[PDB]
Symmetry: C4
Amino acid sequence: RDFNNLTKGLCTINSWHIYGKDNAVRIGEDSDVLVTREPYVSCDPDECRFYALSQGTTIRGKHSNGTIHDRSQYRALISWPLSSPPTVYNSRVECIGWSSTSCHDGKTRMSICISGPNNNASAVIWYNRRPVTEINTWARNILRTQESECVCHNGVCPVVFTDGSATGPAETRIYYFKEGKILKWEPLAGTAKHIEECSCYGERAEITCTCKDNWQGSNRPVIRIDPVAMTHTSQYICSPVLTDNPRPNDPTVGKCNDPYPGNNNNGVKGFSYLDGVNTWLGRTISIASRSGYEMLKVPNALTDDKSKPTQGQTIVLNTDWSGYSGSFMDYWAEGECYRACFYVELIRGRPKEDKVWWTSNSIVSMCSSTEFLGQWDWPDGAKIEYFL
Amino acid sequence: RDFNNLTKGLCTINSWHIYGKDNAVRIGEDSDVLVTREPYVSCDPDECRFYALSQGTTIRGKHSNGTIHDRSQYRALISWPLSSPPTVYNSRVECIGWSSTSCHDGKTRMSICISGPNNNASAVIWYNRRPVTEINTWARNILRTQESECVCHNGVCPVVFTDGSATGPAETRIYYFKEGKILKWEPLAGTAKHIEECSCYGERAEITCTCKDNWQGSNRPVIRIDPVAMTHTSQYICSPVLTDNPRPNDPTVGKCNDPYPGNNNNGVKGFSYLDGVNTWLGRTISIASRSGYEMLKVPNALTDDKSKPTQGQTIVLNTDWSGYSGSFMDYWAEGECYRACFYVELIRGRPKEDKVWWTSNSIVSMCSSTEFLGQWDWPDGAKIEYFL
Amino acid sequence: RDFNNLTKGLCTINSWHIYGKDNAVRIGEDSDVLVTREPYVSCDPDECRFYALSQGTTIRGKHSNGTIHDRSQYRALISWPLSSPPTVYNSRVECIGWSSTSCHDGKTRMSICISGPNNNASAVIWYNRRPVTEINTWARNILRTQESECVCHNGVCPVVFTDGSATGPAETRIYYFKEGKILKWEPLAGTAKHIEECSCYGERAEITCTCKDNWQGSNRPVIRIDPVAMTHTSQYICSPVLTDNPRPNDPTVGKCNDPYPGNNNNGVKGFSYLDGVNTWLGRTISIASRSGYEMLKVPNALTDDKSKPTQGQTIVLNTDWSGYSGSFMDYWAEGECYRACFYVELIRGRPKEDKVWWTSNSIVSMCSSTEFLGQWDWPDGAKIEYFL
Amino acid sequence: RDFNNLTKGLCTINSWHIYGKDNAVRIGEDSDVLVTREPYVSCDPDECRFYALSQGTTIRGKHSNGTIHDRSQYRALISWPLSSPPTVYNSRVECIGWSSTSCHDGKTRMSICISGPNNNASAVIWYNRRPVTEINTWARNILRTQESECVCHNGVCPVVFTDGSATGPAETRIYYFKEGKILKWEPLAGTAKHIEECSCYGERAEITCTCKDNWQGSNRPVIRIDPVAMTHTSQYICSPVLTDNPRPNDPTVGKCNDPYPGNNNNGVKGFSYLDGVNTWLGRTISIASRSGYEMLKVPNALTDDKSKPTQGQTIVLNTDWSGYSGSFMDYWAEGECYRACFYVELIRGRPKEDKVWWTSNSIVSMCSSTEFLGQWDWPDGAKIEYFL
Ligand SMILES: *[C@@H]1O[C@H](CO)[C@@H](O[C@@H]2O[C@H](CO)[C@@H](O[C@@H]3O[C@H](CO[C@H]4O[C@H](CO)[C@@H](O)[C@H](O)[C@@H]4O)[C@@H](O)[C@H](O[C@H]4O[C@H](CO)[C@@H](O)[C@H](O)[C@@H]4O[C@H]4O[C@H](CO)[C@@H](O)[C@H](O)[C@@H]4O[C@H]4O[C@H](CO)[C@@H](O)[C@H](O)[C@@H]4O)[C@@H]3O)[C@H](O)[C@H]2NC(C)=O)[C@H](O)[C@H]1NC(C)=O
Ligand SMILES: *[C@@H]1O[C@H](CO)[C@@H](O[C@@H]2O[C@H](CO)[C@@H](O[C@@H]3O[C@H](CO[C@H]4O[C@H](CO)[C@@H](O)[C@H](O)[C@@H]4O)[C@@H](O)[C@H](O[C@H]4O[C@H](CO)[C@@H](O)[C@H](O)[C@@H]4O[C@H]4O[C@H](CO)[C@@H](O)[C@H](O)[C@@H]4O[C@H]4O[C@H](CO)[C@@H](O)[C@H](O)[C@@H]4O)[C@@H]3O)[C@H](O)[C@H]2NC(C)=O)[C@H](O)[C@H]1NC(C)=O
Ligand SMILES: *[C@@H]1O[C@H](CO)[C@@H](O[C@@H]2O[C@H](CO)[C@@H](O[C@@H]3O[C@H](CO[C@H]4O[C@H](CO)[C@@H](O)[C@H](O)[C@@H]4O)[C@@H](O)[C@H](O[C@H]4O[C@H](CO)[C@@H](O)[C@H](O)[C@@H]4O[C@H]4O[C@H](CO)[C@@H](O)[C@H](O)[C@@H]4O[C@H]4O[C@H](CO)[C@@H](O)[C@H](O)[C@@H]4O)[C@@H]3O)[C@H](O)[C@H]2NC(C)=O)[C@H](O)[C@H]1NC(C)=O
Ligand SMILES: *[C@@H]1O[C@H](CO)[C@@H](O[C@@H]2O[C@H](CO)[C@@H](O[C@@H]3O[C@H](CO[C@H]4O[C@H](CO)[C@@H](O)[C@H](O)[C@@H]4O)[C@@H](O)[C@H](O[C@H]4O[C@H](CO)[C@@H](O)[C@H](O)[C@@H]4O[C@H]4O[C@H](CO)[C@@H](O)[C@H](O)[C@@H]4O[C@H]4O[C@H](CO)[C@@H](O)[C@H](O)[C@@H]4O)[C@@H]3O)[C@H](O)[C@H]2NC(C)=O)[C@H](O)[C@H]1NC(C)=O
Ligand SMILES: *[C@@H]1O[C@H](CO)[C@@H](O[C@@H]2O[C@H](CO)[C@@H](O)[C@H](O)[C@H]2NC(C)=O)[C@H](O)[C@H]1NC(C)=O
Ligand SMILES: *[C@@H]1O[C@H](CO)[C@@H](O[C@@H]2O[C@H](CO)[C@@H](O)[C@H](O)[C@H]2NC(C)=O)[C@H](O)[C@H]1NC(C)=O
Ligand SMILES: CCC(CC)[C@H](NC(C)=O)[C@@H]1[C@H](O)[C@@H](C(=O)O)C[C@H]1NC(=N)N
Ligand SMILES: CCC(CC)[C@H](NC(C)=O)[C@@H]1[C@H](O)[C@@H](C(=O)O)C[C@H]1NC(=N)N
Ligand SMILES: CCC(CC)[C@H](NC(C)=O)[C@@H]1[C@H](O)[C@@H](C(=O)O)C[C@H]1NC(=N)N
Ligand SMILES: CCC(CC)[C@H](NC(C)=O)[C@@H]1[C@H](O)[C@@H](C(=O)O)C[C@H]1NC(=N)N
Ligand SMILES: [Ca+2]
Ligand SMILES: [Ca+2]
Ligand SMILES: [Ca+2]
Ligand SMILES: [Ca+2]
Ligand SMILES: [Ca+2]
Ligand SMILES: [Ca+2]
Ligand SMILES: [Ca+2]
Ligand SMILES: [Ca+2]
Ligand SMILES: [Ca+2]
């Protein structure tokens, strides 16, 4: 009943344990499972749930045809019980739109959905399941946001938005909301040259967001926000362990204040936990496509431009499809530290599997362990041939 | 735990933002979605839900054949979570019947359902999910009511009913209920000549209802109710911007105290927000059929017989089917004013799409913003060819 | 939180209004609706629900074949929200068995299910959703009970059971339970010669049960129970308006203390409200089969052997199938009197409709009004041809 | 709100009454029922639920093919309302994995799921629906646990795990958890030579577990745990009434401190209630396959190596398939004693019914009665031919 404060630091990450997995595409082959994409996980004080952008049709439905498309009037942010699949009957609509973010401040939840045509989109900010504030596009070119949870501190929940070209300079803004109202907003500052789809987490009154430089960088831009002062900084992960996709092969020295070149106008949402020697980066295994997923322990990745891995864990084999990935934590758990968690979107269907006419995904999610646990791989598990 | 009082005025409407959309016909192509019509939205102090008259069959079910019919023994008022579709498994039956209204008074909900043959229908008034009062037909010709939410003030919830011919003078009554009991009723007074399907909202201890003159008027009749004195007045929207359907082309001067002629014996349920310069009217785009939907800002529409639009917003393109529309507000929201909202029923199937043997709909709903937001169009989205 | 006491009398019954209807067979043609039979309605202090004996299969399922059978290991007492259909996903299992009763005492619910082979059945009495007491068959011939709600007074909930032949003298017992424990039991006394499937209601600290004399009577046996003294009496409804089925044509004088002859070894569960001039009897319209349903006002039917109808209401046309019927009331409603209610089981399938291989039903239920309301008829509504 | 203490003794078992049955395979022939195996039952202070390991697909789904397999990435521990079937829409995922246990301590529930490849599995211990502790494999050979509920006393919930060969000596550990944290662990001691899948219950501050000696014994190993001292003992049921499967014919003298020989490297999870003369053993009827199920009253079975049955009850006929069986009790029921309960997994499909490509099960469960109740048999009830 009081706003949550980010008073703890991250727990020591020595490995990752399975947290949730919905097997949605497998189950949806013969049950009323909604087509989704851009999933994430977010916790309330008494429950943690899966979230995603529905496409407003089931996977077996005839309206699944054409669901590779990103922005239609039939999309909505939905949430559903942890590890169940997103069904027609258990999915709760949080708001209507084709780009979203959502977070609980300790008292209630803020959810944000953006909708509209490319040149006239608008964000609606919901708080306590009611619409409170609206924001019109400022650059008239696909106003858009995180696609994973936001983070709050003493009621202030910063959110990163981008409006403008995805393949050149754009207008990124950091909005500071409280009870769904705008306290302040600032234009992006720092050395990040382009920002998309930030994945954020909080610890010791600081919010760290790992984003995607769609324009030029194969290294990831990082925004660090002070939610009390309502100010931020930006840079890139200095490490040569490159974590966007597609991307060039890893070098031996990265770039701290500029995009690491080699691949232009493409990328995938991803994340990292940046905490000195307790630093872990996620990335696709393939440098060319959204296939495979691994976690690499890269001490001081944010600030050391020669930092390389000292430990790792395979999450998804390179022979299995992956997709977006993002961070979340259960800020209401017991204990002295916050346990880092992440999800990986396992994309099925188009464009990589074009024998089917749809595009959907399932979710797998892990949280850190202080033990050094054995590893397994966690594929989507569905057989495309069954849907033919 | 206290009855709600209409103490606030309307927020300034500068545009409309998306509030909810269930994509029911799209989803129902491959899931157990009930056939409905005559939908609406209504809020409780802790939740807002979609409501509609079920036809007692799913859309893919063989019993969907013949659902163009208005009044069968298989209909019921159902409610379901905001923006989910009306499924067999998540729909809550409020009462049995083929005409309804429902509203929360701040303590609990009153729901009214009318059933019976044309010459012997009766209304049952439920309060706190129990039947409390019954009213027999008084004119023996399809006793019927709003098809959208009623409004309460200090426990008094006025409801408009009509019994008698739909194409000549009829017997309209305004009932004032409190805890599901009849405090008083009055025959319609004022200059409205015929009343059907009123759409109501409340602000500053006054309830305004925009209804449909099925007999002669293409302008809409308006009933204004004082819920404390339990008295009312009636007139027509004076504006030349005609909002029924079908309707003749717009003139330059309307009629305040008589039906605007040109079209007889037909009409569609609709609504308006009448608040001086903050006045917005909804209407179908087509003058001939239930196609398209737009909101027009028409300053002083109620009292100015030459008032024309000063701003507008397209909700549904004229190349997409629309249908009934009505008003509702979240009277339990935070803030200093009541935010105007509306829904549009998107009718699919018969009679306009007769390759299918059913008639159903989906819902789209918006609420006002004080920003001037970009506009999008919101069609039902289902492909009729898939149901063949 | 206190046990309910039967302190009120019945409201004056001047007509019947629609209360609930699930349209289960119609909806179940294309959705996962369980096959049932022997339904009823029962209220808790905060909700009223539909109850029935599942057959442990959906209607469209291949295991629906053979569901005319009464007693299998796949049956269970289930409950579900008022007017929704009994689906796989919303049905709550109360206990396992093929004969049941259930009632709320004001604090929590007692549910009783009987299971077993014909010569070795046993009743399990559940209280607060936990098994508390068990009763073994005493006559080794289909131990069985009401098939509709029981009634409680100050925690004492009497229940009528029968064990022994259905076509000759049997051993009927009245058990008085409190918190699921046996306080006392008594053998049937009075002039009723055979008792089956009692339908009960309570008012002014007396419980009245209208049962079925399967052996010889076409008039119905009546048991009146004093739940404080834990004693009872039995007789038959004296009226010549005969209410079992099948039955001979109505005479002009009935029998008070013996079975009215003409039909042997058959019958249907039914009910009545016996309250002086406020007396209403339900019955099938047909004298030969379970078809049609009507309510007849028969002043002093219990004690006047020449009493005939003074008013009536058709519930189901004689061209539509009916079935079991029973009484229930919402003992937790507001107001000064208890409103009489009843349900009618609308049986579909075998044996009357043998083109399908299943037997199921839907439910329709009404409650009394003090108004003289217009009447409608309420058929099941499903088209058997669709299931072929 | 206080930890539960095992202060009561067992009620006198004079017979068994039906408690729950989900008919999952029958219902799942035409509804969205998940494929499962390794089910169990466990109670919270306010509800009792069915639990099982999902296979992450429905039974009618094409992904049901291959579900004989024990350990995939698509398995999860799920729970669902007592006697309903495990559907896609009502099943709650407790954790991800292919081996589990779960128990309520009076304050909240602890659930444990093991996942991973055979040589690198790990257990995750959840408490209050959040991950708290992780345990890595210690013998690198299928770390695994009970497959039925654990038992708590004053917050201490002992759990038995095994890691290592299933057909030779292995490394069994007894972990003592409290609030999901490890208080202590001990290696197995006593004369049991191999332990698998323990079935446990508690009474008078002692926890008794009946397990399976997969390696050499056809008699069952028994572990008795003192949850206060956090110590244990082990032996075998001395009785000649052999209760594993497959097994040799019963001798006249059993073995107390060594495996009863005749069958190697196979077995089925089972259980017993060991309480002096109030001792009842469950077993398959067949000595060769998982067919039939019976309860036998065998006074002093644990300590008397010549003890034979004095009473019995058939649960499942030998012409019907059975499977795993385990113990649970409602520790929060009213009364002076704990009522012994058990479930039997009714396995359908492979390997015994190989015309279908799946393996699943339904559940039947009973609790003891102090009456001597008539017996019935409770088969799964589904017709395999319908799934072809
Ligand atoms: C039971 O489970 C346990 C626990 O999971 C298992 O133990 C785990 O085993 C893992 C696999 O060996 C291991 O993970 C590796 O950790 C390495 C770090 O450790 C080593 O180095 C440190 C530092 O010197 C030592 O202290 C330590 O002792 C070790 O020697 C990582 O380096 C590994 O990652 C690299 O390899 C994999 C391929 O295996 C790549 O996918 C990965 O991206 C890394 O390599 C690429 O990137 C680097 C960095 O730029 C390049 O230098 C390199 O050339 C590669 O680049 C190519 O590939 C990438 C990706 O495609 C591409 O972008 C690029 O352009 C190039 O083409 C790996 O993470 C766990 O740490 C270990 N855990 C523990 C606790 O022990 C155990 O095996 C299991 N048991 C059984 C029996 O199965
Ligand atoms: C990004 O989004 C923003 C925000 O949504 C977009 O900006 C919006 O743009 C809208 C479209 O232009 C605009 O809506 C129009 O507003 C007009 C009022 O503004 C004009 O007049 C006022 C008053 O003088 C000026 O102050 C102002 O500056 C403007 O000049 C309305 O008049 C418009 O409605 C009329 O036109 C549409 C067709 O476009 C009809 O559907 C509608 O019914 C109205 O016209 C009929 O009715 C009138 C009244 O009787 C008749 O006079 C007229 O002849 C028409 O009658 C025929 O048609 C009807 C209907 O079929 C029939 O019944 C009748 O019989 C006749 O056959 C319209 O509402 C928004 O206000 C504007 N918002 C803002 C904040 O700017 C922006 O464009 C987007 N950007 C991009 C790049 O897309
Ligand atoms: C709008 O709705 C309103 C309200 O519903 C409608 O008004 C209702 O109209 C109903 C139909 O007319 C009416 O119900 C009838 O009531 C009769 C009692 O009223 C009459 O008698 C009293 C006493 O003298 C007068 O005071 C009063 O003014 C009336 O004259 C009942 O007697 C009626 O039931 C009998 O008829 C029906 C057939 O219509 C049978 O189904 C029924 O079982 C009864 O008859 C059988 O049983 C009796 C008793 O033994 C026998 O004597 C008789 O021969 C019949 O027996 C055969 O049939 C049975 C059944 O199959 C079989 O077992 C037996 O062996 C024999 O074969 C009937 O109940 C409502 O009371 C009335 N309500 C009000 C408030 O007015 C209005 O019409 C609607 N408007 C429109 C325009 O539709
Ligand atoms: C109404 O319901 C009531 C209540 O349920 C019914 O009454 C019940 O009737 C049951 C069936 O008769 C009965 O159960 C039997 O109880 C026997 C114990 O009672 C007898 O012995 C005691 C001790 O002397 C006496 O005091 C008592 O009066 C009785 O005489 C058990 O011994 C029975 O189990 C044995 O038989 C069944 C076959 O019927 C086997 O399945 C079972 O495993 C037992 O036999 C095997 O095991 C023993 C022990 O090692 C061997 O000695 C024996 O040779 C068998 O071994 C072969 O088979 C096993 C299993 O396949 C295999 O592993 C082995 O290698 C060998 O091949 C049985 O449990 C209930 O107690 C009784 N209840 C009451 C309260 O009365 C009533 O009948 C019903 N009414 C109607 C009309 O139906
Ligand atoms: C709506 O207005 C009525 C007064 O007109 C308020 O009613 C009073 O409420 C208080 C609190 O329960 C009582 O002590 C009075 O007896 C109430 N009755 C009247 C008629 O005076 C009501 O509280 C107002 N609602 C809200 C939400 O404030
Ligand atoms: C189970 O036994 C323990 C005592 O061994 C009880 O614990 C005490 O409970 C009271 C009430 O909360 C506290 O004041 C004590 O501090 C508790 N702790 C101990 C270890 O003493 C517990 O209440 C018992 N459970 C029930 C349901 O009675
Ligand atoms: C055109 C801008 C893109 C972000 C860099 C685009 N975002 C939106 C709001 O459309 C994403 C991108 O095209 C898709 C992907 O790369 O997987 C997802 C897609 N995201 C969503 N549909 N929500
Ligand atoms: C005959 C009277 C009509 C109202 C003016 C009629 N109302 C009823 C209760 O039947 C409506 C009208 O026929 C249909 C429509 O125009 O869309 C809906 C239909 N409304 C409903 N079925 N609830
Ligand atoms: C053989 C005894 C009958 C009661 C007089 C019989 N009751 C039971 C428990 O089987 C009923 C009768 O055969 C069926 C009917 O007449 O509709 C229902 C059937 N009732 C149930 N299946 N619950
Ligand atoms: C290889 C070890 C076996 C236990 C002795 C094995 N356990 C696991 C975790 O795989 C079980 C056994 O193979 C199957 C059975 O006998 O029915 C179930 C299977 N149990 C599970 N799948 N959970
Ligand atoms: Ca470089
Ligand atoms: Ca990039
Ligand atoms: Ca004019
Ligand atoms: Ca009109
Ligand atoms: Ca289906
Ligand atoms: Ca006679
Ligand atoms: Ca009879
Ligand atoms: Ca021996
Ligand atoms: Ca063995």
